[PDB]
Paper text:
Plant HISN5 catalyzes the sixth step of the HBP, in which imidazole-glycerol phosphate (IGP) is dehydrated to form imidazole-acetol phosphate (IAP). The MtHISN5 subunit contains a four α-helix bundle sandwiched between two β-sheets whose four strands are almost perpendicular to each other. The dimensions of the MtHISN5 oligomer did not change significantly after the binding of IG2, indicating a lack of major conformational rearrangements. The active site of MtHISN5 (see below) contains two Mn2+ cations (Mn1 and Mn2) bound by residues belonging to different subunits.
The crystal structure at 1.55 Å was obtained in space group R3 and comprises eight chains in the asymmetric unit (ASU). The crystal structures cover the MtHISN5 sequence starting from Gly77 or Ala78 through Arg260/261 (chain and structure-dependent). The crystal structure at 1.55 Å resolution contains imidazole (IMD), sodium ion, chloride ion, formate (FMT), 1,2-ethanediol (EDO), glycerol (GOL), and tris(hydroxymethyl) aminomethane (TRS). The crystal structures were obtained in the presence of formate (FMT) between Mn1 and Mn2, which completes their coordination spheres. FMTs primary location was in the active sites, between Mn1 and Mn2. However, it was very interesting to find that IMD (IMD1) bound not between the Mn2+ ions in the active site, but instead was positioned approximately 3.8 Å from the C atom of FMT. The fact that we see FMT between Mn2+ and imidazole positioned differently suggests that the bi-Mn2+ cluster has a high affinity for carboxylate, in addition to the imidazole of IGP or IAP. We postulate that the carboxylate and imidazole binding sites can be used as pharmacophores for the design of selective inhibitors of plant HISN5.
Residue numbers in the entry:
A (entry chain B), C (entry chain A), D (entry chain A), E (entry chain A), F (entry chain B): 77 to 261
B (entry chain E): 77 to 260
The structure:
């Protein structure tokens, strides 16, 4: 009875395959073509207890933008498919994740209405090879296809890797809460 | 043994009857004479899983103030009665409720000491016919008779209906948490 | 064959029926339960040459918010359905509409990615009975279900009725341009 | 049949004759007694494809003000006459005209309601013998008798001749668009 | 007969071949040695309906500057050759292109007088491997050999890839408009 | 020999009938569909000694804007008709009207050139049901069809009803002066 969503989409720019189990055990199998994004998608599994499979190739010789965007769009669609009729779930999720000096709060509602409120202050332009502009775009695209209300608020942080990873930990744990069943419903 | 509180009070200005079940299933029956307040009281039921019955008539030809106040006072008293000795409950409740661009956090303690910390920025004076000054007065009056410590904090929001509705969603879910029993 | 999109949705709050003909002749048939919004929807027909049929009733005894939102959502869905595969259309639309002292520019792309950039300065809270906060929410909701990129920018204006009506005229003409066929392709 | 408007008016100060063909081929025939204004009126023909005939003499021994004003008034009246019932025309016109470093946007509506929004920053007081205060007065007077809604906005420019000429190019192209027939209606 | 311009130039730094068809069907054939610039040149084809063939190699072991510059110079020369006597063309082009949150307006005139007005605010120094200083230099060099008046103005935008891509979409559509024939003349 | 002007105009939005006697005795018969506007039009009669008849119905279910505008336009046309050749009249009018704490000066010229200079500071958005944005629009529209130069300047005032009523008293008395005959002419 596990809630599994899957999305495959091939364009001239990217080839994306995503599978997510909302009732998973934290199995991570992420090969997006973007190593830092893979590290962040691993946090979805380890902290959200989702099973997350992502396989993507794309025009990373231009930059990571199209791959990042199309992976995020596909995850949002897979999430929407896995949620089904959304009956009985908590629907709302909240979590404040510290990572050393970083502290990020995520508040979300599986509402069917896309909205991103985004207030991160990432002080460097690259983490490894990853363009830090792509963090906002990842969550914006995921919101757009999942129909999620998502608020990301940075309360502390100076290390870009810490800020982004804390965001994914908080998102993962908030999304876990929202997708879990409300025992009184 | 569901925890049910009830308050009826008739004054020269208003006639108010309130019944709340802390262990409800979200049954909403709200007819306060103020349609937007009814919509907000419905959030108490649907998001707090309270059973909420409010029936009020009043001098709404003056304005909604006396009705709004007397309904809020009665709800706080009904909540206090329903809580009884408060043994074994979580007592504290916390929730951040987004509603599109709005985000409101509610933190409360069923402490017996009334206090309202209120920091909403509602940018318009009317939602429908509802005077938005009445939002603060609703929570102040409810706090005063329930003896609740209540903190309402707006983190984002531009639409007045969204801000107020997010506040009631967060309040409902925080109050649900506070009234539920601590398993340990 | 004319491109027609139609959507009916009944909720506990609203009862909404929408039909739009992208290849219309300007037939205006708008009865949303919100008279000023009807006047604005008429601009879609008169200036966009769309055939626009909207019939809605709702919980306007609370306020106009739910009706306004559900009408906007339904129009966006009807627009999306009417566009079909979007093959051969201009896709982009641009128009600056004056209305006396008001001047509003609209730029849009039928992109499949929802985004609203909104920069109006409406100086009063009510036009008739219409809550002027509902203008932004109308376009946000329409954007969300149509998948449109939409930018609304006020360059001039002091009368709220003029500002909002100029916005709908500019939107109507930009959308007409975007939905029309590109004769070269 | 071409839409032609013609107006002659003789006062104690000026003697003005104007004929404009909205469906012209760009015939420029401008002898206002103000050489720089003639150069600007030529842009109406060359860029708007109007046929523009202006012949004026006046009390230019005082200054160019009365001639400038009476020419502008007459052009607006001729334009109004030529438009007739305005059935089937685009009615709105928009154009951004660059001239080297200058860039001026014109937005107009053949509305029947006079309004001038004017935001040029002309940095010198004379172009040749032409008093640059007369630019605003020209468009104000033309607006007043034509019943036009007209917005002129400078986005760039440092040379007064360039700024004014770009304004007339943009006006010419916007007016051409507004007076042309809408092929769909 | 299609208007085709072609230019080959070999220097000690670069080897550049360009062919452009002003009356094309959107054939994109761009291999400049700079992958992000290739992606931008593709917009010329996809949104301008030009046929754009660019093949360049160069001293990219130093940086992309010489290749970027020499490609831009060659495109401007090819455009100039293809335009011929410019008889009968619209000559002016205008377009506002959104790309999600980005919005860029381009206004241009095929005037024979080079000028670049450039007002982009690109917030990162690299898109992929592409140095974002090269955007201004690309358009400056293209302007210089084509003899174009070109104004680029950013109205919105936070993602560098979006801002630059919106600029090339707007440029492509403005240039398409300017090079197309004026049906009335 | 009384100077009487009359205007009837029926549109899809409004049905307006106006009759004004410049040589009246202050007979007021105003039913515009806007009660506060009726009160203001009564001031024209009582303070200007005009006979003022206005009968209007319109789409006041939207708001009062279209009715307000069309009544003002019709009054301006009726005024222009009543003035005839304007021979022998004072032409200029000036009056400062106090109303308790409010003080408003009106200066006008029956010039044939429309202009409104408007400097009121009305501190509330509604007087009764009347939208105070409509005051400026009333005088602007009246100016546009009458061809009047009109300057309205607030020197004092805090009560919106007082400010607007003082404006109409001052306008009425200034217009009375301007329409009266100059005994030396
Ligand atoms: Cl606003
Ligand atoms: Cl100036
Ligand atoms: Cl920059
Ligand atoms: Mn993108
Ligand atoms: Mn790490
Ligand atoms: Mn009170
Ligand atoms: Mn609601
Ligand atoms: Mn809403
Ligand atoms: Mn209107
Ligand atoms: Mn003058
Ligand atoms: Mn010149
Ligand atoms: Mn260089
Ligand atoms: Mn791209
Ligand atoms: Mn108006
Ligand atoms: Mn009074
Ligand atoms: Na943000
Ligand atoms: Na209607
Ligand atoms: Na000449
Ligand atoms: Na390529
Ligand atoms: Na003013």
């Amino acid at each position: 009875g596990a809630r599994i969503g899957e999305m495959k989409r091939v364009t001239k720019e990217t080839n994306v395959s995503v599978k997510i189990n909302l009732d998973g055990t934290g199995v991570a199998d992420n090969s997006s073509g973007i190593p830092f994004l893979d590290h962040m998608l691993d946090q979805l599994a380890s902290h959200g207890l989702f099973d997350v499979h992502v396989k993507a190739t794309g025009d990373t010789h231009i930059d990571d933008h199209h791959t990042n965007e199309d992976v995020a769009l596909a995850i949002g669609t897979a999430l929407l498919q896995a949620l089904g009729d959304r009956k009985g779930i908590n629907r709302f999720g909240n979590f404040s994740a510290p990572l050393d000096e970083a502290l990020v709060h995520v508040s979300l509602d599986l509402s069917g209405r896309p909205h991103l409120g985004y207030d991160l202050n990432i002080p460097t332009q690259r983490v490894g090879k990853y363009d830090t502009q792509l963090v906002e775009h990842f969550f914006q695209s995921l919101v757009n296809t999942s129909g999620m209300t998502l608020h990301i608020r940075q309360f502390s942080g100076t290390n870009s890797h810490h800020i982004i990873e804390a965001t994914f930990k908080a998102f993962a744990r908030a999304l876990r809460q929202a997708t879990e069943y409300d025992t009184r419903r």
